[PDB]
Design a binder for this molecule. Sequence first.
Ligand code: HEM
Ligand code: HEM
Ligand SMILES: Cc1cc(N)nc(CCc2cncc(CCc3cc(C)cc(N)n3)c2)c1
Ligand SMILES: Cc1cc(N)nc(CCc2cncc(CCc3cc(C)cc(N)n3)c2)c1
Ligand SMILES: C[C@H](O)[C@H](O)[C@H]1CNc2nc(N)[nH]c(=O)c2N1
Ligand SMILES: C[C@H](O)[C@H](O)[C@H]1CNc2nc(N)[nH]c(=O)c2N1
Ligand SMILES: [Zn+2]
Lengths: 404, 403
Amino acid sequence: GPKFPRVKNWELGSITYDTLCAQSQQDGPCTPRRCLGSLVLPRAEQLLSQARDFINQYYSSIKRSGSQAHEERLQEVEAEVASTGTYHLRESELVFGAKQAWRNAPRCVGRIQWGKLQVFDARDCSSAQEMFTYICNHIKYATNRGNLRSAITVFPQRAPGRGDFRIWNSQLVRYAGYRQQDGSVRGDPANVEITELCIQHGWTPGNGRFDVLPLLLQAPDEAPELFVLPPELVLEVPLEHPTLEWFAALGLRWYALPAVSNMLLEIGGLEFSAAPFSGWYMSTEIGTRDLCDPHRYNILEDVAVCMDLDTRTTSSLWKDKAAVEINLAVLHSFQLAKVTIVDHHAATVSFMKHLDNEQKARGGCPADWAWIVPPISGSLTPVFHQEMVNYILSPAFRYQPDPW
Amino acid sequence: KFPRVKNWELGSITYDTLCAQSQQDGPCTPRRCLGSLVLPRPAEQLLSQARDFINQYYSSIKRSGSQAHEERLQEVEAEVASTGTYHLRESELVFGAKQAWRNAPRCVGRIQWGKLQVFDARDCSSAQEMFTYICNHIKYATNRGNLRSAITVFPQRAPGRGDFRIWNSQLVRYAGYRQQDGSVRGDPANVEITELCIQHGWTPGNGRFDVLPLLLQAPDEAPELFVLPPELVLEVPLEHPTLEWFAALGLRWYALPAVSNMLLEIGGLEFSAAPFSGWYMSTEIGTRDLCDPHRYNILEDVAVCMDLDTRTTSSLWKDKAAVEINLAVLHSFQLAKVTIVDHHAATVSFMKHLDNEQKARGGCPADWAWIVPPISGSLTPVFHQEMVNYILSPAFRYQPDPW
Ligand code: HEM
Ligand code: HEM
Ligand SMILES: Cc1cc(N)nc(CCc2cncc(CCc3cc(C)cc(N)n3)c2)c1
Ligand SMILES: Cc1cc(N)nc(CCc2cncc(CCc3cc(C)cc(N)n3)c2)c1
Ligand SMILES: C[C@H](O)[C@H](O)[C@H]1CNc2nc(N)[nH]c(=O)c2N1
Ligand SMILES: C[C@H](O)[C@H](O)[C@H]1CNc2nc(N)[nH]c(=O)c2N1
Ligand SMILES: [Zn+2]
């Protein structure tokens, strides 16, 4: 009977109703006529009502809803907008909003960790050199010699008629992709453009499969400046397999720290164009997507040849078998090197726990089924059997187009 | 207006224009996507669905606007106006059936859509006759292992009476027997239907792979029980190409996947019993049927045979055993010479189908969550392909269990 989306788990037969989706103040790309759930990108008074709503969220979370401190903050916000066209978050409001944005992110399977996020405030930053210092500090804290810690650094918000703080790299740590004489790519094909941009801005490039890119950092109304990360700060894990002795001879490696640098963090209508955040990897990200996507490192055939598989027919399941060993290699190598990582089984189990916590706390959890289900062994994980409702809540992270 | 659809592996983009032909709303709204939900919960109407469908039929034979087209629209007007309903010509039924398959967004096997044997069983008046028709279908579709797609269409729904229904969800299914210890012997998905069969007089077996009888219901009658002749149900014992102990697990599956509980809708008419069959994609058996925790749940058994470390998720014992179970399914079907398709072959052919449908109709409705296989998703090309989901008619439609 409840007038809210009914949500079922088909493994366990259990039912919930999502009431949180009523809080959503932003349309996705679906209509009654057609579902667009699988698209990667969907394409004055406004600020105030967004600001008012965020402040209500803040005072709810500290249980001071309706208090005069709440009403005074409301009054203080609209008087700021009244005279400057914008307003500013208090420190504890920023901390709240950043965690809430992570909590609200439908595509993230790691949200059980949402309440544990180090928020570095960098809203004082005023140069690209200073952005560099801030980022190096973030990487150091976040990496913590392999005992990885979730973190976000928040640079100054968009200002009317002032250029943006931007990190040009899509991640803080990524490998170069060098377009070759014969059309092929050495390194990571995903990163051909950013690699070419780094060179155009004066970077002397390497010639390897795994060259850490430098950072391209843009302070307001200036050309971006180039910064090389000192190698001692970028922790990497050489890949070996627990029983296949030859795997180490492949010279494969990956970096410890997954750190998104190109997303817009929106809080109460305010927009933080540079606010890089980092966690730790789920092993499928490296072992399945990064290493096996045809349009990435594409190592599946090489590994299956080493494994002596029949690569000439689909029904030998050579792709499936090779992908499994590569994944096991990612896990074993990170474990050996004492770098935090989580396999897709533990990650999804922990996300089911998170669904249950959020059901109690907020009456639902926005989630993108296609992104939550891992790219190998999907139905072997509990999330495969769990219906999910997807909607946009704010605070939010947002994809933003490349600044070039 | 028209959604951009992108393949992320290849960089190629199409636009879906077919979706403007959808007449029926799905579960999503701009506020929230419900695309992952398995089921979401007069004469003038029927006349326009009928006109539209007849328009589709004559268009498909390139006789659009001809005398036979106009006179067939008149026939339908006249029949509906006098009786509240009408009847399809056999060739139109044939067209409608193929098109309902074509339009099925959860089906990865649609490259085959133009090749479907259609049995007209609309002259059925008893559970007995239904049983005979079902037996011909099975024998025909099975064809000693060289499987052939088929559908049998029983009499349509009528305003003045109950439905023809097949109580079973599939024609061939294994029994599930609830035990004293609250565990299940056989297939846990079929405990309820096994219990109905027993209640309607079936003497039950006691194995893990006991083929269920059929419960067939003619209008307003109690369902009747019919045992499938064991020589008609082709089965495949499962063994592994290199792991010799696998055969000892005594595992087996049936050759013929035949859905018997869906409703076929054509030109506004509803066929409540219209069982259809193709051939298996190996992951349905290897991954879902055998490995789902609420199914035969054999993963831990196999992984232990393979001597894997089960104590820890990080050894990827589940992933290892799942692949070997799938391989055993493929090998066993190929050895027994029964048609089967692996998920790589199937999804590659589906990509081709998307390309064909783009040229033919300017799109293809597809449910990404159902099209992407349950193991090795991103290792298939469909993972990287955006898809657009919507309801076209003719259609297969889910219907609730008759009891
Ligand atoms: C703590 C360990 C974490 C794990 C294991 C984790 C896991 C994941 C995974 C597997 C994805 C899908 C990525 C892909 O397929 O490319 C993802 C996406 C995402 N994660 Fe988490 N995450 C973690 C921490 C964080 C943190 C600290 C934040 C932000 C504060 C975050 C926010 C996001 C966002 C916004 C996305 C969507 C990215 C996009 O749309 O490109 N995650 N995460
Ligand atoms: C010829 C070989 C065929 C293959 C390889 C194939 C493959 C598949 C697969 C893998 C699924 C999803 C099954 C699941 O996860 O439960 C499916 C669903 C479906 N198939 Fe096909 N199929 C074939 C033939 C047919 C035929 C002949 C029809 C009807 C004439 C058909 C209509 C459907 C429908 C309506 C669904 C959705 C069923 C539901 O919602 O329960 N398929 N198919
Ligand atoms: C077109 C486009 C849209 C979009 N929303 N995201 C992307 C990039 C997706 C993407 C690719 N590689 C890496 C990531 C980061 C994933 C990531 C982030 C964090 C914080 C932890 C963790 N385990 N994993 C994200 C591209
Ligand atoms: C609650 C519910 C809803 C729904 N739409 N379908 C189902 C059953 C789905 C289902 C389960 N087992 C088996 C099948 C048959 C799938 C199937 C059908 C055909 C014709 C060929 C082929 N290779 N595979 C379908 C259940
Ligand atoms: C087309 C499809 O939406 C796209 O390939 C998605 C599918 N699911 C995904 N899921 C995750 N976690 N990451 C991705 O990059 C993708 N890609
Ligand atoms: C909740 C989720 O939608 C459900 O488990 C779906 C996912 N994808 C599927 N895909 C196929 N082919 N068959 C299924 O039964 C399912 N189950
Ligand atoms: Zn949707």
